[PDB]
Subunit: 248 residues, 3 copies
């Protein structure tokens, strides 16, 4: 197999990015091409599809000789990546053997070897879906709404109308409603082709947003009784996308 | 029953205030009048009386049509109030039904409904007591003294003389003494009509001061073998008062 | 026995210093002389020798009438010292009786009495050893290397060559290497008489460095199959030294 070397400036930020996807994934195939690194995976229950796309432009050095796929234990990977410091440079390097060499370069050079595994490749595509609502909002609104709703229920209803986005949860001894209009600072954009209603499991939503930052911009696309698509951008050009089955 | 709407600027600070009283209380009757909101309660052991007085002037909007009392599960209330952010506006609103509508307004509008309960109203008054010592001190001195004493014993002796306030605890394998004179920055005022000695349970004192801030000014009034009265002010005009039975 | 009074400006910093040695020690004899305070102890397994030297110059007041030794329960001592604040002045005073009086003076005067114990005095000396490598490095490099290695193994190999210092750990499902040259900011000095290799237990190293600060300068001296000597300086003139048996 051909070697590659991939360098990212800011190892803690790369660790944070990986921890977001690792919240639902145990293992993942990473496709390394000359245009960038991509990773598509499902959670063990097949309720959530994760798609992480890291184009070559976000790496300070990108040397990939031929396309290849590597399989990675995500919790081992996250354990090593959690050792990187904010100011560290991260180097991912594969030689001829079956392991990833992970180097942090900062006040010292620290090198880990991570054994590569074989990951069964479900043939996962991200199809195009007839979404009828798009919502852009601040991560902290989304995070707090999912936490608020968890005080009440295990499912969260999303309601998009022309002028307002509403998340609503109700239980026996409680109820909670989170409402956004474009007058609110939490809602950066709202495009609604028609009145759209759908519900989603809170345990999955919490794991999806746990690593998202309070100032991150998150785009939601959904439809009536359709999956929820949730993405946010990494370093302007990278992108993390979740696709979440509806609660029906 | 008549509706009311009550608005407080700074929801996290209102949550903090409620958590202080919630440390000893499971449930409480809130008397809502046109002059403000008051709450008088005892802990389950009847050792501590709590009196919280929130005058209308600390609320940015105060619309109370007729006096009424509502009963509240304090741990449910604290759970909801803990979701408010520092910059949020808090709205407490009762309509015609038997629930409190709690709204946080900030980057988004989040609304919870809290079921109102029935709280047995012990006829609690805050009588006037012939205290012989008054002490004003910084919260952190009081907090650290109670923590220091807990390393040693389960009761804390308060000793007020004309020129010094002393808190003293002794156990078998330890002893601790905390001494204040007006020369010390921790003691803002000391008025002692006669030499005064009394002891109090540390487990109650710790729960009383847990939510008090390090820079808060706390007034203590006590007498020989008498209850301890402890109060501090909320937004200059609100007031939280504890009355604690002596250890005899 | 003769009284003494010893005053240290900055009680939290004295607590931190004591907690470093307390990580491996349960009890210790403190020799109080006119030149300063010293403490030599071994961990319960006799794998680590600890030597703490606090010269009279680091104390704002130092009144010792005649040399004497006192025995101290280190976990009781640390428990009391943890109550001191950053701005507090710490006073250690022995009168005629068999207890240490520990006073924190700040916003208030708080006084604890700590019973003195009898500590069996192993006749411990810090002999001179034919070390062949000396390494000065930033504490955070050392701390992170020991943490990195603990992901992999229970022993850490130290390798000193003329131009590089290497710490290396290997396990079955992992390996880690930390490399320093004088080009690196983590390595402040490297003196190597000959190529030196030795290994040490990670559980002991972690307890040795747990209290060391990220910006502290740490000196390591070791030899092939010899003990590791690790010291850093307290207030320029105090010194904490560990001597750690090799893993053979």
């Amino acid at each position: 197999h051909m070697p590659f070397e991939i360098v990212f400036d800011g190892a803690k930020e790369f660790a944070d990015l990986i921890a977001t996807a690792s919240n639902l994934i145990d293992e993942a195939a990473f496709k390394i091409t000359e245009e960038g690194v991509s990773m598509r995976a499902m959670d063990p229950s097949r309720v959530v599809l994760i798609d992480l796309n890291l184009p070559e432009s976000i790496f300070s050095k990108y040397e990939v000789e031929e396309p290849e796929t590597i399989g990675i234990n995500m919790d081992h990977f996250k354990k090593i990546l959690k050792r990187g410091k904010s100011k560290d440079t991260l180097i991912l390097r594969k030689g001829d053997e079956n392991f990833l060499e992970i180097t942090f370069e900062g006040t010292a050079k620290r090198t880990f070897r991570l054994p590569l595994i074989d990951v069964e490749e479900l043939e996962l595509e991200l199809p195009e879906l007839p979404f009828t609502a798009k919502v852009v909002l601040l991560g902290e609104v989304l995070k707090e709404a999912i936490k608020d709703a968890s005080l009440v229920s295990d499912s969260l209803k999303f309601i998009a109308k022309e002028d307002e986005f509403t998340m609503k949860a109700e239980g026996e001894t409680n109820e909670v409603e989170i409402k956004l209009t474009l007058e609110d600072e939490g809602l950066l954009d709202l495009e609604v082709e028609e009145e759209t209603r759908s519900a989603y499991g809170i345990s999955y939503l919490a794991d999806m947003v746990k690593g998202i930052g309070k100032a991150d911009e998150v785009t939601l696309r959904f439809g009536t009784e359709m999956p929820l698509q949730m993405d946010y951008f990494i370093r302007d050009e990278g992108k993390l996308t979740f696709l979440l089955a509806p609660r029906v």
